[PDB]
Amino acid sequence: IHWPCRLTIGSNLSIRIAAYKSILQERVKKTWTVVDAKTLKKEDIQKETVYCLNDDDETEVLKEDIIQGFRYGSDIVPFSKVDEEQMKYKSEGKCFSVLGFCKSSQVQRRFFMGNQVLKVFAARDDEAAAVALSSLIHALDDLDMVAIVRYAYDKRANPQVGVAFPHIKHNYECLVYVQLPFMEDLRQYMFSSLKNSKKYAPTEAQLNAVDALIDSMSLAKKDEKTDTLEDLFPTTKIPNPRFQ
C-alpha cells in the first residue's frame, strides 16, 4: 500500500516521497479458536481474566477497582492510564527528516533492527519531486556516504532512526530504509579471541582438509567465465514450506 510522506533537509528543502513496503516477515492470517469437544460451538466456551486479591482470596475484585503500576527499584509507583496518556512523548505526526550524511562504512549489516524494510521510491506520477529524489540518490551512489533518517509512522508510533542506502537498478531507482539501534538497544559482550588461542589452533592438514571441503560444497559456479557468479540453489526464492 502507498505510504505518503515528505523527505526534508533543513527547513525549506522538501521532496514529496512515497515509501512502499518491502521485505517483511509474514505470518498466517487465520487463527485457532478454542472450541468445546461436545457440540463444536465456540459460544459454549467462555474465558475471562478474574483478578483476585492476595490474602485468603476474595469474592471478586472488579475491573473498575484496578489501576496500573510500574516497578521502579524495589517498590512500586502507582501510575495510571490517564497519566500515561497525559505525560508521555508527543511527536509531530509522520516525519522522514534527514539528520545528516555519513560514510557508507560506519553502518554495517549487523547493526540493523526492525521486522521490515522500506523502499522510499519517489512522489506520485508527477515528475517534479522524482527528479530531485533521483538527483539525491545519484549523488549518494556515484559518490559515497549514506543518509541517516528520522522516521515515524504515525502520531502514536514511536520515532526511529535508520539508514537510506542508494539503490540503483536498470529498471527503477530508489533508496531503502532499515532501522538502526538506539543507545539502550545495544548490547556489548566479551568473547575470547579465536586466533590468538593456542589450544584450538588448527594444524596445516586440518586447514587443507577444510579448504577442500568448502571448495567442494561451493554453491556458486563461475560459469562461462563471464565474471558472472551464476547461482546454485538460492534460498530467497523458495516459498515458506510452513504454509504449504
Binding site: 483478578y51 486479591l53 477497582d65
Partner: peptide
C-alpha cells in the same frame, strides 16, 4: 505494567 488494587495499592494476582 502491573495491575494494582486501588484501595490498598498492592499487586493483585490474576
Amino acid at each position: 505494567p502491573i495491575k494494582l488494587y486501588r484501595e490498598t495499592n498492592e499487586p493483585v494476582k490474576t
